Short mmCIF file of C-alpha atoms and ligand atoms in Angstrom, two decimals:
data_model
loop_
_atom_site.label_atom_id
_atom_site.label_comp_id
_atom_site.label_asym_id
_atom_site.label_seq_id
_atom_site.Cartn_x
_atom_site.Cartn_y
_atom_site.Cartn_z
CA UNK P 1 -23.78 26.45 14.19
CA UNK P 2 -23.10 27.32 10.75
CA UNK P 3 -24.85 25.18 7.76
CA UNK P 4 -23.80 24.32 4.27
CA UNK P 5 -26.01 22.75 2.05
CA UNK P 6 -28.59 22.23 4.61
CA UNK P 7 -26.64 20.21 6.89
CA UNK P 8 -24.28 21.24 9.95
CA UNK P 9 -20.86 22.43 9.41
CA UNK P 10 -19.69 23.40 13.01
CA UNK P 11 -16.58 24.89 12.96
CA UNK P 12 -16.80 28.21 14.66
CA UNK P 13 -15.79 30.65 16.37
CA UNK P 14 -12.21 30.34 14.96
CA UNK P 15 -13.40 29.57 11.12
CA UNK P 16 -15.88 31.51 9.42
CA UNK P 17 -16.89 32.52 5.95
CA UNK P 18 -17.57 28.93 4.42
CA UNK P 19 -17.83 27.82 0.88
CA UNK P 20 -18.55 24.26 -0.55
CA UNK P 21 -16.11 22.80 -2.31
CA UNK P 22 -17.04 19.15 -2.58
CA UNK P 23 -18.01 15.47 -1.36
CA UNK P 24 -15.27 13.86 0.66
CA UNK P 25 -15.60 10.03 1.72
CA UNK P 26 -17.57 10.44 4.66
CA UNK P 27 -19.00 14.12 4.66
CA UNK P 28 -18.82 17.55 2.94
CA UNK P 29 -15.42 19.53 2.08
CA UNK P 30 -15.49 23.36 2.59
CA UNK P 31 -12.85 26.53 2.40
CA UNK P 32 -13.10 28.51 5.11
CA UNK P 33 -11.39 31.98 7.03
CA UNK P 34 -8.95 30.72 9.76
CA UNK P 35 -9.50 33.94 12.04
CA UNK P 36 -6.41 33.01 14.05
CA UNK P 37 -3.78 32.49 11.16
CA UNK P 38 -5.76 34.91 9.17
CA UNK P 39 -5.69 32.48 5.74
CA UNK P 40 -8.52 30.74 4.42
CA UNK P 41 -8.00 26.84 5.00
CA UNK P 42 -9.79 23.67 3.76
CA UNK P 43 -12.21 21.72 6.30
CA UNK P 44 -13.51 18.21 5.83
CA UNK P 45 -16.52 17.17 7.58
CA UNK P 46 -16.59 13.30 8.58
CA UNK P 47 -18.90 11.23 10.24
CA UNK P 48 -18.06 7.68 10.40
CA UNK P 49 -19.01 6.53 13.80
CA UNK P 50 -21.99 4.37 12.63
CA UNK P 51 -19.72 1.98 10.50
CA UNK P 52 -16.69 0.19 11.87
CA UNK P 53 -15.30 0.28 8.22
CA UNK P 54 -15.48 4.17 8.21
CA UNK P 55 -14.00 4.21 11.87
CA UNK P 56 -11.09 2.18 10.47
CA UNK P 57 -10.27 4.54 7.57
CA UNK P 58 -10.72 7.63 9.58
CA UNK P 59 -8.61 6.28 12.27
CA UNK P 60 -6.14 5.31 9.71
CA UNK P 61 -5.83 8.71 8.03
CA UNK P 62 -5.60 10.71 11.23
CA UNK P 63 -2.86 8.66 12.93
CA UNK P 64 -0.64 8.53 9.81
CA UNK P 65 -1.06 12.20 8.74
CA UNK P 66 -0.48 13.21 12.41
CA UNK P 67 2.78 11.30 12.65
CA UNK P 68 3.99 12.28 9.20
CA UNK P 69 5.48 15.71 8.53
CA UNK P 70 6.80 16.11 4.78
CA UNK P 71 6.09 19.16 2.13
CA UNK P 72 4.47 16.62 -0.38
CA UNK P 73 2.11 14.90 2.02
CA UNK P 74 -0.85 17.09 3.56
CA UNK P 75 -0.77 18.08 6.93
CA UNK P 76 -3.46 18.10 9.48
CA UNK P 77 -3.61 21.81 11.05
CA UNK P 78 -6.54 21.10 13.51
CA UNK P 79 -9.26 18.90 14.45
CA UNK P 80 -12.56 19.87 15.48
CA UNK P 81 -15.00 18.04 17.56
CA UNK P 82 -17.05 18.12 20.33
CA UNK P 83 -15.53 17.76 24.00
CA UNK P 84 -17.10 14.42 24.84
CA UNK P 85 -17.03 11.25 23.20
CA UNK P 86 -21.04 11.23 23.88
CA UNK P 87 -21.33 14.72 22.29
CA UNK P 88 -19.05 13.91 19.19
CA UNK P 89 -21.09 12.77 16.20
CA UNK P 90 -18.60 14.62 13.61
CA UNK P 91 -14.90 15.26 13.16
CA UNK P 92 -13.43 17.98 11.07
CA UNK P 93 -10.22 17.96 9.65
CA UNK P 94 -8.45 21.28 8.96
CA UNK P 95 -5.76 21.28 6.10
CA UNK P 96 -3.86 23.94 3.93
CA UNK P 97 -5.97 24.98 1.26
CA UNK P 98 -4.84 23.53 -2.02
CA UNK P 99 -6.46 25.26 -5.15
CA UNK P 100 -6.77 21.87 -7.09
CA UNK P 101 -6.37 18.41 -7.37
CA UNK P 102 -4.43 16.36 -10.40
CA UNK P 103 -7.94 14.83 -11.29
CA UNK P 104 -9.67 18.05 -11.53
CA UNK P 105 -6.45 19.64 -13.14
CA UNK P 106 -6.16 16.85 -16.11
CA UNK P 107 -9.82 17.22 -16.90
CA UNK P 108 -8.88 20.59 -18.73
CA UNK P 109 -5.16 21.51 -18.57
CA UNK P 110 -2.56 19.96 -20.79
CA UNK P 111 0.69 19.81 -18.77
CA UNK P 112 4.32 20.95 -20.19
CA UNK P 113 6.83 18.41 -19.72
CA UNK P 114 8.47 20.80 -17.25
CA UNK P 115 5.07 20.27 -15.24
CA UNK P 116 4.92 16.72 -15.66
CA UNK P 117 8.69 16.40 -14.41
CA UNK P 118 8.05 18.53 -11.21
CA UNK P 119 4.67 16.57 -10.53
CA UNK P 120 6.35 13.31 -10.78
CA UNK P 121 9.24 14.55 -8.57
CA UNK P 122 7.16 15.67 -5.62
CA UNK P 123 4.81 12.46 -5.85
CA UNK P 124 7.93 10.26 -5.76
CA UNK P 125 9.52 12.36 -3.13
CA UNK P 126 6.41 12.31 -0.81
CA UNK P 127 6.28 8.43 -1.46
CA UNK P 128 9.78 7.93 -0.41
CA UNK P 129 8.87 9.12 2.77
CA UNK P 130 5.81 7.29 2.68
CA UNK P 131 7.64 4.02 2.05
CA UNK P 132 10.47 4.79 4.38
CA UNK P 133 7.75 4.65 7.43
CA UNK P 134 7.13 1.17 6.27
CA UNK P 135 3.70 2.55 4.73
CA UNK P 136 1.92 1.75 1.72
CA UNK P 137 -0.56 4.14 0.42
CA UNK P 138 -2.80 1.57 -1.80
CA UNK P 139 -4.78 4.25 -3.19
CA UNK P 140 -2.43 6.81 -5.12
CA UNK P 141 -4.63 8.41 -8.12
CA UNK P 142 -4.86 12.02 -9.64
CA UNK P 143 -7.70 12.93 -7.19
CA UNK P 144 -5.43 12.25 -4.34
CA UNK P 145 -2.42 14.61 -5.25
CA UNK P 146 -3.69 18.01 -4.24
CA UNK P 147 -2.00 21.11 -5.86
CA UNK P 148 -1.77 24.77 -4.77
CA UNK P 149 -1.57 28.03 -7.24
CA UNK P 150 2.46 27.67 -7.16
CA UNK P 151 2.16 23.72 -8.34
CA UNK P 152 3.42 22.55 -4.73
CA UNK P 153 1.96 18.99 -4.82
CA UNK P 154 0.75 17.29 -1.84
CA UNK P 155 -0.43 13.55 -1.35
CA UNK P 156 -3.58 12.85 0.61
CA UNK P 157 -6.03 10.41 1.72
CA UNK P 158 -4.47 7.75 3.43
CA UNK P 159 -7.87 5.71 4.35
CA UNK P 160 -6.63 2.74 2.66
CA UNK P 161 -3.02 2.83 3.82
CA UNK P 162 -1.49 -0.36 5.46
CA UNK P 163 2.04 -0.83 6.92
CA UNK P 164 4.12 -3.30 4.56
CA UNK P 165 3.75 -7.19 4.90
CA UNK P 166 5.48 -8.64 1.96
CA UNK P 167 5.90 -11.73 3.79
CA UNK P 168 2.00 -12.36 3.53
CA UNK P 169 1.37 -10.76 0.18
CA UNK P 170 0.48 -13.96 -1.24
CA UNK P 171 -3.23 -15.15 -2.15
CA UNK P 172 -5.26 -16.96 -5.02
CA UNK P 173 -6.43 -15.71 -8.14
CA UNK P 174 -9.31 -13.04 -8.61
CA UNK P 175 -9.14 -12.34 -4.93
CA UNK P 176 -11.57 -8.91 -4.18
CA UNK P 177 -9.60 -5.75 -3.61
CA UNK P 178 -10.76 -2.20 -2.64
CA UNK P 179 -8.36 0.25 -4.00
CA UNK P 180 -9.26 2.32 -7.27
CA UNK P 181 -9.71 -0.15 -10.30
CA UNK P 182 -7.78 1.99 -13.04
CA UNK P 183 -4.49 2.29 -10.72
CA UNK P 184 -4.34 -1.08 -9.60
CA UNK P 185 -1.17 -3.60 -10.50
CA UNK P 186 -1.80 -6.55 -12.50
CA UNK P 187 -0.88 -8.68 -9.67
CA UNK P 188 -3.78 -7.79 -7.57
CA UNK P 189 -5.97 -9.57 -10.08
CA UNK P 190 -3.50 -12.95 -10.15
CA UNK P 191 -1.83 -13.35 -6.63
CA UNK P 192 -1.46 -10.19 -4.50
CA UNK P 193 -3.18 -8.96 -1.23
CA UNK P 194 -1.23 -5.39 -2.30
CA UNK P 195 0.99 -5.61 0.82
CA UNK P 196 4.11 -4.55 -1.16
CA UNK P 197 5.68 -1.08 -1.97
CA UNK P 198 5.53 -2.14 -5.59
CA UNK P 199 2.01 -1.64 -5.48
CA UNK P 200 2.27 2.19 -5.00
CA UNK P 201 5.12 2.20 -7.85
CA UNK P 202 2.21 0.87 -10.26
CA UNK P 203 -0.11 3.38 -9.53
CA UNK P 204 2.77 5.99 -10.05
CA UNK P 205 3.44 4.79 -13.08
CA UNK P 206 -0.17 5.00 -14.02
CA UNK P 207 -0.24 8.50 -12.73
CA UNK P 208 2.70 9.37 -15.12
CA UNK P 209 0.95 7.81 -18.16
CA UNK P 210 -2.47 10.01 -17.49
CA UNK P 211 -0.18 13.19 -17.15
CA UNK P 212 1.18 12.72 -20.40
CA UNK P 213 -2.11 12.25 -22.62
CA UNK P 214 -4.97 13.69 -19.77
CA UNK P 215 -6.55 10.19 -20.21
CA UNK P 216 -6.36 7.09 -18.12
CA UNK P 217 -3.93 4.48 -19.51
CA UNK P 218 -6.07 1.48 -18.49
CA UNK P 219 -9.50 2.46 -17.87
CA UNK P 220 -11.07 -1.11 -17.25
CA UNK P 221 -14.79 -1.24 -16.87
CA UNK P 222 -14.80 -4.14 -14.18
CA UNK P 223 -12.33 -6.28 -12.07
CA UNK P 224 -11.12 -8.54 -14.61
CA UNK P 225 -11.11 -6.16 -17.41
CA UNK P 226 -8.60 -4.33 -15.88
CA UNK P 227 -6.13 -7.16 -16.18
CA UNK P 228 -7.36 -6.97 -20.08
CA UNK P 229 -6.16 -3.24 -20.68
CA UNK P 230 -2.85 -3.82 -18.91
CA UNK P 231 -1.94 -6.85 -21.12
CA UNK P 232 -3.25 -5.24 -24.25
CA UNK P 233 -0.38 -2.56 -23.75
CA UNK P 234 2.33 -4.80 -21.77
CA UNK P 235 1.81 -7.90 -24.21
CA UNK P 236 1.71 -11.04 -22.97
CA UNK P 237 4.41 -11.90 -19.68
CA UNK P 238 7.46 -13.73 -20.40
CA UNK P 239 8.24 -17.36 -19.33
CA UNK P 240 10.19 -15.82 -16.56
CA UNK P 241 7.58 -13.54 -15.35
CA UNK P 242 4.93 -16.45 -15.61
CA UNK P 243 7.48 -18.79 -13.45
CA UNK P 244 7.33 -16.28 -10.62
CA UNK P 245 3.39 -16.86 -10.50
CA UNK P 246 3.08 -20.20 -8.67
CA UNK P 247 -0.45 -19.90 -8.31
CA UNK P 248 -1.83 -22.07 -10.97
CA UNK P 249 -4.91 -20.70 -11.39
CA UNK P 250 -3.39 -17.13 -12.09
CA UNK P 251 -0.84 -18.80 -14.12
CA UNK P 252 -3.08 -20.91 -16.50
CA UNK P 253 -5.50 -17.97 -17.07
CA UNK P 254 -2.52 -16.01 -18.61
CA UNK P 255 -1.35 -19.32 -20.43
CA UNK P 256 -4.79 -19.37 -21.84
CA UNK P 257 -4.52 -16.16 -23.50
CA UNK P 258 -3.33 -15.72 -27.23
CA UNK P 259 0.14 -14.03 -27.64
CA UNK P 260 -0.31 -10.23 -27.31
CA UNK P 261 2.62 -7.85 -28.73
CA UNK P 262 4.00 -4.86 -26.42
CA UNK P 263 2.46 -1.26 -27.76
CA UNK P 264 5.59 0.92 -27.51
CA UNK P 265 5.36 3.65 -25.31
CA UNK P 266 6.18 6.06 -27.94
CA UNK P 267 3.49 5.09 -29.97
CA UNK P 268 1.06 5.69 -27.21
CA UNK P 269 2.84 9.09 -26.39
CA UNK P 270 4.31 10.50 -29.52
CA UNK P 271 4.92 13.92 -28.17
CA UNK P 272 6.59 12.78 -24.63
CA UNK P 273 10.13 13.15 -23.29
CA UNK P 274 12.09 10.06 -24.33
CA UNK P 275 13.41 9.57 -20.77
CA UNK P 276 9.84 10.36 -19.45
CA UNK P 277 8.95 7.02 -21.43
CA UNK P 278 11.92 5.06 -20.30
CA UNK P 279 11.12 5.77 -16.41
CA UNK P 280 7.22 4.90 -17.21
CA UNK P 281 8.30 1.43 -18.86
CA UNK P 282 10.23 0.71 -15.40
CA UNK P 283 6.98 1.53 -12.98
CA UNK P 284 4.77 -0.11 -15.26
CA UNK P 285 6.51 -3.57 -15.33
CA UNK P 286 4.63 -6.73 -15.26
CA UNK P 287 6.82 -8.45 -12.58
CA UNK P 288 6.51 -6.66 -9.28
CA UNK P 289 10.27 -7.89 -8.34
CA UNK P 290 11.33 -6.24 -11.28
CA UNK P 291 9.69 -3.01 -10.87
CA UNK P 292 11.44 0.03 -10.02
CA UNK P 293 11.57 1.13 -6.32
CA UNK P 294 10.70 4.82 -5.21
CA UNK P 295 14.52 5.75 -4.89
CA UNK P 296 15.68 4.44 -8.16
CA UNK P 297 12.99 6.41 -9.40
CA UNK P 298 14.18 9.59 -7.88
CA UNK P 299 17.57 8.87 -9.28
CA UNK P 300 16.34 8.32 -12.83
CA UNK P 301 17.85 10.73 -15.74
CA UNK P 302 14.41 12.06 -16.44
CA UNK P 303 14.29 13.57 -12.57
CA UNK P 304 18.01 14.98 -12.84
CA UNK P 305 17.13 18.63 -12.48
CA UNK P 306 15.43 17.95 -9.26
CA UNK P 307 17.13 15.05 -7.75
CA UNK P 308 18.93 15.40 -4.23
CA UNK P 309 18.73 12.68 -2.09
CA UNK P 310 19.92 14.79 1.15
CA UNK P 311 16.61 16.88 0.54
CA UNK P 312 14.54 14.08 0.04
CA UNK P 313 14.08 13.24 3.51
CA UNK P 314 12.87 9.79 5.41
CA UNK P 315 10.49 9.42 8.37
CA UNK P 316 12.18 9.26 11.91
CA UNK P 317 9.94 6.72 13.10
CA UNK P 318 8.35 3.96 10.63
CA UNK P 319 5.29 2.31 11.87
CA UNK P 320 -9.80 -4.97 11.45
CA UNK P 321 -11.46 -6.45 14.53
CA UNK P 322 -12.08 -3.61 16.77
CA UNK P 323 -15.99 -2.67 17.08
CA UNK P 324 -16.68 0.68 16.19
CA UNK P 325 -17.41 1.81 19.80
CA UNK P 326 -13.44 0.98 20.62
CA UNK P 327 -12.87 3.00 17.28
CA UNK P 328 -14.61 5.86 17.99
CA UNK P 329 -12.84 5.81 21.54
CA UNK P 330 -9.60 5.65 19.68
CA UNK P 331 -10.35 8.58 17.13
CA UNK P 332 -11.70 11.01 20.48
CA UNK P 333 -7.92 10.15 22.13
CA UNK P 334 -6.06 10.54 18.50
CA UNK P 335 -7.69 14.20 18.19
CA UNK P 336 -7.44 15.18 22.03
CA UNK P 337 -4.32 17.29 21.15
CA UNK P 338 -6.37 20.12 19.38
CA UNK P 339 -8.48 20.77 22.34
CA UNK P 340 -7.80 23.76 24.39
N1 ZAS Y 1 -11.44 15.04 -0.38
N2 ZAS Y 1 -12.06 14.88 -1.32
N3 ZAS Y 1 -12.78 15.50 -2.39
C1 ZAS Y 1 -14.14 16.33 -2.36
C2 ZAS Y 1 -13.21 17.44 -2.98
O1 ZAS Y 1 -12.31 18.35 -1.82
C3 ZAS Y 1 -11.27 18.55 -2.64
N4 ZAS Y 1 -10.21 18.84 -1.28
C4 ZAS Y 1 -9.53 17.92 -0.63
N5 ZAS Y 1 -8.79 18.24 0.41
C5 ZAS Y 1 -8.47 19.64 -0.22
C6 ZAS Y 1 -7.76 20.75 0.56
N6 ZAS Y 1 -6.77 20.54 1.29
N7 ZAS Y 1 -7.65 22.06 -0.19
C7 ZAS Y 1 -8.89 22.11 -1.27
N8 ZAS Y 1 -9.48 21.07 -1.91
C8 ZAS Y 1 -9.55 20.02 -1.09
C9 ZAS Y 1 -10.96 17.67 -3.59
O2 ZAS Y 1 -10.03 18.17 -4.34
C10 ZAS Y 1 -12.31 17.61 -4.04
O3 ZAS Y 1 -12.91 18.31 -4.92
#
């Protein structure tokens, strides 16, 4: 039973020569040598069974990643756990080993325009598949974009993912939300539960802005500060866009604000490709019904050297109340195919 940083990392004998990488949501992430496939892999240790919420996100991630098969979405290669529910205290998810992620990369590396274009293409190609399965990722951000040494990009962490539900998207003003603050669309704070595909496009727009300058475009320090930042750049919403917000508390909040002018993208990003900024503007559109969709974004002139719909595949088969005991049982069943 191998140990890393003083805790159990129980993956042998197939996987040996372990190296710590970092901290996942429910445990440690290590690299290891796959003695069968003769390559180093990543292994995530996950310990969710004490908490219903952890079990939920774990079941979501396993179920979605096992059903998806796409070049720009991380796969699950193997799942290691004990042979019985009684003995299962942890689960290990084995994935392709990716050199870095976009969050780590952006801390020290300036991206060429060619890299930004290629990364954005791969993000949207993966997202097209996700959305085509009627799934919302709901936590897209640089740290959930993995990169290998040849800059192949794979979306990961579907722990907050949901099936799209636009008929039930409406909610009140300042309704609490889980996903990462800096990448939250303005409507989350106003009247949206994040059950439509436009929630993900907003996050991608934030990611594009961040690739252009190595800094988050909207770094709110708390829930309502996030909306301040968004409106400080987009300016005041139009009457038409306000008229789409029927909730009085949210609409009157916006009406209470002094007028703010839009900040031109090319003043924020004077080095950027003008076509990139045109696409950025369409992803960071205030009104979620006017916001560009993933297939339109792929067809945008900025991505012309990569766009090819026949090489941008969709899913064959599109897709909170359960106690942790049933969820542990479902996780055990979902991982059985890798036993042996
Ligand atoms: N998840 N997570 N975060 C903890 C660390 O694990 C890293 N990580 C997650 N999945 C992989 C992966 N598949 N390959 C390499 N590193 C990975 C991620 O970049 C963080 O530095």
